[model samples]
Target: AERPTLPIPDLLTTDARNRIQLTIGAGQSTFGGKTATTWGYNGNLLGPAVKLQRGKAVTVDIYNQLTEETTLHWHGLEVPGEVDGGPQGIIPPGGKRSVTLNVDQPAATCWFHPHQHGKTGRQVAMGLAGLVVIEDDEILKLMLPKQWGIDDVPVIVQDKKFSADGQIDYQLDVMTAAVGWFGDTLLTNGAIYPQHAAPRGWLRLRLLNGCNARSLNFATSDNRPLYVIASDGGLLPEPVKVSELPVLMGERFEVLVEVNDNKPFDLVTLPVSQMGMAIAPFDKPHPVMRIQPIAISASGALPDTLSSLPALPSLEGLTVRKLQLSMDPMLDMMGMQMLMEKYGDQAMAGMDHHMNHGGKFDFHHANKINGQAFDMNKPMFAAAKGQYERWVISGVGDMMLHPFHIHGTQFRILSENGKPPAAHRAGWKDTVKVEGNVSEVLVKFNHDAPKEHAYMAHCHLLEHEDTGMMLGFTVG
Candidate 1:
């Protein structure tokens, strides 16, 4: 069998009236002349792109044409928790799940992928993901490239294992988990050796690191400052020029790059392979994609204003709440082994659930949020509608960075650990990376909108979330 090339869905238009079928199957791919079974989305490799307008109600009727059950998570969307589409609902084999997304967030790029509890890592590794862009009239007024398939590009960065036939594989074993997995091939936009015909002036690029456990160190050839405009939520107040982008798993960045007319430039993203000593031999630097400029578009400019953000309130006289994030690798490994011993072969499959919010699997009172783990039936925090309150978040020792995300609203970071947040982060944000060593994040809760449904707050790691790290709050 040959490597399957998935189709890139058109996301430039806001009208998506088609019911998309997501087929999950294993095809044969060979690397060292050996055959291996690998999974794919839709036609084979990856899923499709979904585009919508901010504040517009969007609907996507998804058909799970997979042999095994899976969950589709629409990451970073400000919809109802049910529509947020994390790990709660199960799309049984051959079943259909309809997600109606009412976009209230600012213009930003997000994504969707399978979120079946313990199977997230493996399912994602097999290529069941895609990019989603939420737009608005405010952003359209800007001078960014509005052309599709030419100047505006969506880069899905991934690494894959190949069989002898040169197709991707996703078979992982015990060793593969401890050391992580890597492949010899690198792909961009679901294509091998993919090329783009970019415009000369300012070309907008929505770059996403879709790899599992892989951290991308982004750089442009010749060390040019990539004009970065926005992050996970939306555009910065102004464009900031930077040469390097330290992109982690589940990170999304939008950059406006001005290529010299008729000039050819290389926009590359390299993996930090040195961090894994056991898998050091598998670590290799590779090119993500190349940018070639076409002088046809004489000039292009960024929008005067990309997003309209609300002013963040102060925590001077408000009540503040905090929490701790922790992880234990040794206990996690032991739990895995014990589970294997108990269930034998069945335990070796799918994502390892039952892990604590801190990513630990062992029994250490489960993980806590504000000294308490999540309880789905209960609201973690409740406030009156239109009432403003300040909250603080802090992370503990050796714990991985927690991309703290909230749904139904966006807040500004007032302060962090008694100091002001970075100027770049002073704007409205939906997700904030809680760094290690008791770092604090101050936020003002917004409750002027709908009062019917509840909002959610959780760690951005899908796996940790599936196990339990999520909590809900309501404003009445």
Candidate 2:
């Protein structure tokens, strides 16, 4: 018997204008003699990768072909309030919404998926997700690997669970709250247990951990360092080689590696060890995927350097702002389900339901950026557009890792639980994972958000994000 394979979605290029019809509905698949329940994007699991270039005034005519109401959330892209594509950005079932966005940021890693607030986890679990790539002249000129089809691979890593009939299932119970739903199957770029072929030259792998609650402890099985060259928003100042990277869902990183062994190598994610979990049976490591380099073709000379990053401003005498986060036991998975069942999902879908059930302002108890929890009324942050102030963010709760992200501007890490700043975070960043007990990062606001435009900060865990584990802030 062969392992199940993930579907391969395509990357789309448009002339600043592309129309996409996405049908969000349950479909039936036949295997042997029986049909299985499944979900699809446009017509299958996961949407098509919508590609654009920097400076392109992109427009997408989206048709919701699904029986259910769903919205396409553009992750990591800056846009106007409507274009941001959050929960309020929903497209009714069998309706259409045309979104126009202007691209001006550097070319880096970005993605899109269903963002219907409380239902984000279940929808994403059942597909309706894909990747987007925006390029520019500067990025193209870089010596980084640029093999469009094979060498330069875009790997979307997601963990999934199946039911008795081989259908994708997202049944969240009490145990799920403690440790979100994680599956035994690991899918990459829609392929299961794939033995991918890559060009023998320096390969650029744009990676995204598109899981719900799983944090990937990834590395190469061959033991070669993953030359991490870029992250969330764009390129790091310089390449920082590392042995392990724990990537939370919605987080992205780029690694450049030159395959010289003339042999195959696999990008593997080890299972969680019980040593790390606070509770019993919580820690166990699993082999996520294999990047089998079956073959590689010689390409042009690899550049000695890749794209450069802008410098972070000095945090000298800046206004010190502090934020605390935590996890409340009452808001565990079971608690949430009970509250939703009793109060009605639609009625209890707002902030009141979240605060009432969890005793905090957020939904996912195990995740939050500040100790007080997520408060929709709590303006993300208040300041002037060009204000030079130092903002400190910490993950104060239990075994939590919040990949904090800020729209409009990038920030820098001051330290982690008062420890020296990690060398991997010396450059500017929009998202930083607060690992272990607690971690802190310092950033300044350079762009203007004014009072109306609120930037976001939240846990990168998509499940937590869709829930109330997110907050909005801004500078006037």
Candidate 3:
């Protein structure tokens, strides 16, 4: 059978008011020629691409048309806690919430997905995700591929498992929850095993790992250099050409692919093991999408420099904090009971630092941060506003890779595995993949939160986040 074709999501343009209406609803999509139930933002499957201009005041009216509650979390956008769309920003079934955001960040490839407590993994896996493009004046002046769906493309890489009849199957068993649900098939823009042809030119690919719990090791099948232009926050100081790169879930990168080759080349993910866990049967190298040049289109050479990043401020006299990712089922249970007993279930849910059992912890590996499950009522730590702090985040003991993410601020990875970070990861980032070792990051809280609505830091693995591997911190 021919490889399935990739579909570029429709773009949602802003009106004169710089406002857009997004409706979260349920529908069915035909994947692999079989109708599968899915959810989306204003569409049947994935949502539309929202182009946001920097310095523009944008407003989004989110309508939840699903039968259950859902929340829209801006993965990389920096806004107030009220508009951050964390677990506290839940929109009830058939309800609506209007969020006004001041687009203050640089040009970057961000995303939005459901952040509902306990249901994030299922909702995202069922297709409630979309892309947001933040454009700035500096990036607009660059001689880059500016087309939306043509030469410049947004690629949402996801993995899914389907039954014999082609229905999307969510295997949320104990094992799957402990070690995320790994899909048997690779998908790009909702297409399975896609063959995507592009016009010959300098193509810009915004890659988002929208999977629930899978880390992708992407490389060209021909071993061509993938020019890395930007990371989660925005453009790097200069382009770094690399043969391969790893993108964990909740992370995004923009790469430039020179479609100079007249023939087709495949973009594939190699086999990657999570720590000590044996590679699963389905965790093999799989083709993501094929790039074929239909015709030779002239493009200018890549400039020596891309964008200039501000030099990091000195870390002198700043606070140094140590955090960790731990797996202790008994400790998790004890912590849960302690919190629930002291502050009832409802209060625990509303607080920022509480942990609960999201799924069956049959594997005895309920992930936690610093040996404590998330406690919504407690602030794990506090940060003074405008104070620079260095966080040393490490995994307790294991073979799994934890994608550590923090909200409300973009950080710089100082070191990974106790040394200087790779060149590709030296840019501004909001998420860093922490293996069974330590990764240090320098961050300062620019936003303030006083009481309940504190900013959160957690493992990006939705299962881990849902099952108490997060922490809340006050910025005021």
Candidate 4:
């Protein structure tokens, strides 16, 4: 099949008052010219690009038009827990919910999606995700690609499995839930084998790994170096040149490409194996998008420094916490029972249910954090507000790489396996891939999350998250 032209998401218009409207509805989309049922924020497949300014107050009006409950979660936004759009902020069918946010984070590329319990993976897999671009004075002053759909682009990469008729066929089997779902087809901005025409000058590409389970290893076809400017949270202190970067699920990166010549290039995802696992025959290297330069239009030179990032704060006398990620059914059930006796059935209302079947528990597919599955009404840990804590997270047993994510905060990777972090992991980050060894991070919570509604931290692999690899905590 010929590569389809990349599709840029529609941009929402924010009025002078910084108010935007988002309508969540179900519609049919033609992917590879085949119509399929999918859900989106304002259109058929995905939501529009919401441009927010730093230090501004913005209000978003959300309207849910689907038949079931859904939510709009700002994945990397540091807002209050109530408005963070966790599972607690559910919008019923035909319901309307509005939230006003005080933007305080730096300029970065973030995203939003549904976070409803047990339905997050399915909803996002069926296409309920969008991009959020946060801009500030610093970003505006930099000499970077500012064009929306032409030179600068938004590339949302996801993997999916389609049926014979080209309709989306979600694989929710036992193996899929255990090892996480792996798709057979790759899609860029909702198109298969997409292509783009790049301007010869510097092109800023905001890459988002929107896949449910797969982690992407991005590189150019000819092994050209990619200048990485920013991570999930924001810009790095200085640009880092890398031949390839690993973008786990629910993570984003802003990279710069210099096209001095008119020759075309191919942006591809290289084959990667986790731990000692070999790449399956079907999971070979594949092109993500084709970049053909219109002409050689070299412009400004990259500055020695892109942005300033504060040094890692002192860790003296800080609280140390050890967290382990594992899968154990018997221990998980015992923990669940113990919690039920304390909090009663009301607190355990939806704790036993999972993603594969209705209220049925599978032993082999169970995942957990600290030997406990996710309990909606449980608080795994508590910390003092504004207190910095050093967390050491280790993967138990023979599990693959798990992208650990913390809601409502961005952390600094102190070390991996007791060694200094790599070039890509040097800056601030919200998610980190943990495998084989332990990963240490310095994190602090600035907001409070009460018992009834708490903040979440879990694996970014949607299937792993949906099954059990998640935990909630309170900060006050």
lDDT of each: 0.60, 0.63, 0.79, 0.79
Residue 333, model 3: Cα distance from true site in angstroms = 16
Model 1 quality (TM-score): 0.76
Q: Per-residue alpha-carbon lDDT of model 3 for 1-476, expressed as tens digits?
A: 77766788877876777679999999888776789889999897788888888888888999999999998988888777778887778799999998988888899989999988766888898989999999999987777777777778888999887888877787544445456665666679888777777777677888999888887888888887889999999998999998888898989999988786577888888766552122443344678888877785735346679898888888888899999888664543554454345435532321224355564543323667887777777879888777778999997575456899998888899987667878989998999878768998998777776546767899888877777778888787
Over 1-476, each residue of candidate 1 has an lDDT whose tens digit, in order, gives: 44333224566343447334445555654334555455565545566677777766756666777788887766666565565554455788877877776667678888878766456767887768877788877777776776656667787777676655654555444333332344555667656545566766787777777766445767776676777778767877777677777665666778877778656667776445222311222243456666666667635577545565556555477666655554345544654565456445533322223444553443322434665556655777675444455556666553344566665555666654346755555565666666554444444443332223355566654444433456667655
Per-prediction TM-score, please? 0.76, 0.81, 0.89, 0.89
Each candidate: RMSD: 7.1, 6.8, 7.5, 7.7
Number of clashes found in candidate 3: 11
**Tens digits of per-residue lDDT for model 2 on 413-462?**
66655576556555556666664545555554544443343566666665
Question: In model 4, where do residues sit more than 4 Å from their true spots?
Answer: 275-282, 296-301, 329-365
- For model 1 the local lDDT of residue 30 reads 39
TM-score of 2: 0.81
lDDT of 3 at 428: 84
Q: What lDDT does model 1 reach?
A: 0.60
Model 2: how far is 156 from its true place, Å?
0.9
- Write the number of the candidate with greater lDDT, choosing between 1 and 2: 2
Residues 1-476, candidate 4: write the lDDT tens digits.
66677899876757777679899988898776788888888888987889888888889989999999997889888887878888788899999998988888889988999998877888898989999899999987877777787767899998877788867788654555555565667789988778888777787788999988777889998888888988998988888999998888999998888765667788888766542112333245678998877774745345678888888888999999877888654434544454345445443232224344434466433788888878887879886678889988888564456888888888899976557788777787889777757888998787887766678888888877887788888788
Model 3 lDDT vs. the true structure? 0.79
